[PDB]
């Protein structure tokens, strides 16, 4: 029986058998006052002490969120839906520690994604026990508020200041600083890692002065704050808050009185109205996301990045070969997960209008022109593949490359990866390729479990990636030094080398998507 005295009271964990060894798990430790009643829409409050023993023996509630039912019964989408009760009382975190208790272990803190509208730390592909077992690091993950409940912004109004979910994440980092030593962890060796909106959160913690001293290094998988979906302007943030107020019958002339009215609404009334706060949307719509609040974010983050105003440390950044394709089956005409989605030129043009609704006709013609220079113009997958690359390059790859270039210009080691292995267990069809989200299981080491029917080559690849991530967190350098691997070189603004990750041949290349990213980063903003 293992029990740990934290600064707020004793917690009891559970022992787990992983790979013929033991990992101790503390699931569902509270780290803030439940943000209920008058605390809804406020920054999270400090946790009042307790004198009993908290049984941290099961995952806690997930934060309120809509659950999309686009593919009912399909494991490809339902593996992402919350697997605990939805409650506003969701500010809990989880801790995996190796057995026996380590002496001074490096800590990896996961921040899940989900477009800032969904997500929970209890997903099976976020299970930190494999990493604890195999690399003897400590894994932490927290639940943070999402959607309106996490990001509604009446900016300057402390009743709804914005960025509440980001402050949830920060309060959890603060908990690790105060308490992880009691679990055998090293508060001075803390690496944040997250994917998608979680990766954008990680990059915002690099900009936030309150987070500076709460972590050492950062890993950004398929996301960064300069991605077009990742920050909502103050103009949209106020239009969306007032639209949500109109939809719930909460329009009041006193801005503080709107929030009082929204605080008496059921979570479901708020959730069912989150969709319609914008008149036009896309599959990458983020209706309630990070804002420049003057607190977590002191200025527009593109300015902070461009002028070197961020934590100076190492970063690991990367993207997957087919970031875009998942978004095509959530709205592009002619696309299906149940057929090969061969689309015509005309369907490609309608696809562009879906993803770029307020872009001029000339702007959409420029995208078409850049992306239809066929190698083989007889190839019938041509338009299907170009629309995927349009959405992936614009929304993830080019922003991540630009983040890494600007960050490394201020003298820090950066490492960039290109993940191009399609999981053999991937439930989505083959035309969707190496999808958004499907490197996570490799990072968390699920293919290390031989029972799970991943291939042998996939076990090798996961084993290698797990070591690289752990070596980055421990030593700031993501090498696999023992198995004659390819050496991962630093990403420099001039050569811009990156590592490809795959089963067959991990190799070094330069200037990923160079021509595409010139179009998106330099030309497309002008249209
Ligand atoms: C800012 O919001 C207004 C209002 O949005 C409408 O009302 C909300 C309560 C919600 O139901 C939304 O879906 C509505 O669109 C936007 O004004 C609307 O714009 C559309 C398209 O331009 C137009 O067809 C509607 O008639 C407008 N309705 C009203 C009441 O003005 C406005 O576009 C938003 N500003 C943005 C998005 O920049
Ligand atoms: C691929 O499928 C899409 C979606 O159609 C649905 O799924 C299919 C597997 C099949 O079971 C269809 O009967 C389903 O309706 C096809 O696009 C649809 O085409 C119909 C035909 O007129 C149209 O009414 C719908 O609006 C279309 N929906 C979308 C989202 O485009 C598409 O034609 C199929 N492509 C190929 C190459 O077979
Ligand atoms: O997950 C989200 C987030 C959202 C998003 C928006 C902007 C940036 C990044 C992500 C998204 C992601 C993928 C498709 C559509 C939307 N929203 C809930 C929807 O159920 C999407 N299902 C989640 C998974 C679908 C298949 C593979 C990817 C994950
Ligand atoms: C635990 O280790 C501490 C040193 O941590 C190391 O230095 C910092 C700057 C980071 O770069 C981190 O990655 C390193 O692991 C010691 O200061 C501390 O006294 C140690 N405490 C115990 C109990 O062992
Ligand atoms: C916590 O778990 C132990 C052992 O399973 C049990 O004896 C104890 O009563 C539990 N405490 C609470 C508050 O449920
Ligand atoms: C609005 O509500 C707040 C909260 O009680 C109050 O302080 C303020 O005086 C009210 N009136 C105006 C005009 O802000
Ligand atoms: C290196 O190779 C051995 C077998 O030769 C394997 O057991 C080990 O897990 C590998 N390590 C990494 C980090 O890939
Ligand atoms: Cl702004
Ligand atoms: Cl490619
Ligand atoms: Cl061009
Ligand atoms: Cl053609
Ligand atoms: Cl297939
Ligand atoms: Cl095909
Ligand atoms: Cl190799
Ligand atoms: Cl390329
Ligand atoms: Na390429």
From Swiss-Prot:
Keyword Protein transport: no
Catalytic activity: an acylcholine + H2O = a carboxylate + choline + H(+)
InterPro entries documented for this protein: AB_hydrolase_fold, AChE-related_enzymes, AChE_tetra, CarbesteraseB, Carboxylesterase_B_AS, Carboxylesterase_B_CS, Cholinesterase
Phenotype upon changing residue 140 to M: In BCHED; allele H variant
Outcome when changing residue 97 to M: Does not affect enzyme activity
Glycosylation sites: 15, 55, 104, 239, 254, 339, 453, 479, 483-484
Disease the record associates with this protein: Butyrylcholinesterase deficiency: An autosomal recessive metabolic condition characterized by increased sensitivity to certain anesthetic drugs, including the muscle relaxants succinylcholine or mivacurium. BCHED results in slower hydrolysis of these drugs and, consequently, a prolonged neuromuscular block, leading to apnea. The duration of the prolonged apnea varies significantly depending on the extent of the enzyme deficiency.
Family as reported in the entry's similarity comment: Belongs to the type-B carboxylesterase/lipase family.
Name of the protein in question: Cholinesterase
Organism: Homo sapiens (Human)
């Amino acid at each position: 029986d293992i029990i740990i005295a934290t600064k707020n009271g004793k917690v009891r964990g559970m022992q787990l058998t992983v790979f013929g060894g033991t990992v101790t798990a503390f699931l569902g430790i509270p780290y803030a006052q439940p943000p209920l009643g008058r605390l809804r829409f406020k920054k999270p409050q400090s946790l009042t002490k307790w004198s009993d023993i908290w049984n941290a023996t099961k995952y806690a509630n997930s934060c309120c969120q809509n659950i999309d039912q686009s593919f009912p019964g399909f494991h490809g989408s339902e593996m992402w839906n919350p697997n605990t009760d939805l409650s506003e009382d969701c500010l809990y975190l989880n801790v995996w520690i190796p057995a026996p208790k380590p002496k001074n272990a490096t800590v990896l803190i996961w921040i899940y994604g989900g477009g800032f509208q969904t997500g929970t730390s209890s997903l099976h592909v976020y299970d930190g026990k494999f990493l604890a077992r195999v690399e003897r690091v400590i894994v932490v993950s927290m639940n943070y508020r999402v959607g309106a409940l996490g990001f509604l912004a009446l900016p300057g109004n402390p009743e709804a200041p914005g960025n509440m979910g980001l402050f949830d994440q920060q309060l959890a980092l603060q908990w690790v600083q105060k308490n992880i030593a009691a679990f055998g962890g090293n508060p001075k060796s803390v690496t944040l890692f997250g994917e998608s909106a979680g990766a954008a959160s990680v990059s915002l913690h690099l900009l936030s002065p309150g987070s500076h001293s709460l972590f050492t290094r950062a890993i950004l998988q398929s996301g960064s704050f300069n991605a077009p979906w990742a920050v909502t302007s103050l103009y949209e943030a106020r239009n969306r808050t007032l639209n949500l107020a109109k939809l719930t019958g909460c329009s009041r002339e006193n801005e503080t009185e709107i929030i009082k009215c929204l605080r008496n609404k059921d979570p479901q009334e708020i959730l069912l109205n989150e969709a319609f706060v914008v008149p036009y949307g896309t599959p990458l719509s983020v209706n309630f996301g990070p804002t420049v609040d003057g607190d977590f974010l002191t200025d527009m983050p593109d300015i902070l990045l461009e002028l070197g105003q961020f934590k100076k440390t190492q970063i690991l950044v990367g993207v997957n070969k087919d970031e875009g394709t998942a978004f095509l089956v959530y709205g592009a005409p002619g696309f299906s997960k149940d057929n090969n989605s061969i689309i015509t030129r005309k369907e490609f043009q309608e696809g562009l209008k879906i993803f770029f609704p307020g872009v001029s006709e000339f702007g959409k013609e420029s995208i078409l022109f850049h992306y239809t220079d066929w190698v083989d113009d007889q190839r019938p997958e041509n338009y299907r593949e170009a629309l995927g690359d349009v959405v992936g390059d614009y929304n993830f790859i080019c922003p991540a490359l630009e983040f890494t270039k600007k960050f490394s210009e201020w003298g820090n080691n950066a490492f960039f990866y290109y993940f191009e292995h399609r999981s053999s267990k991937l439930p989505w069809p083959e035309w969707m390729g190496v999808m958004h989200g499907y490197e996570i299981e490799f990072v968390f080491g699920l293919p290390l479990e031989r029972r799970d029917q991943y291939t042998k080559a996939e076990e090798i690849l996961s084993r290698s990636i797990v070591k690289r991530w752990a070596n980055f967190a421990k030593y700031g350098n993501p090498q696999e030094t023992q198995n004659q691997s390819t050496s991962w070189p630093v990403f420099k603004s001039t050569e811009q080398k990156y590592l490809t990750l795959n089963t067959e041949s991990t190799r070094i290349m330069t200037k990923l998507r160079a021509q595409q990213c010139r179009f998106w980063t330099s030309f497309f903003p002008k249209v």
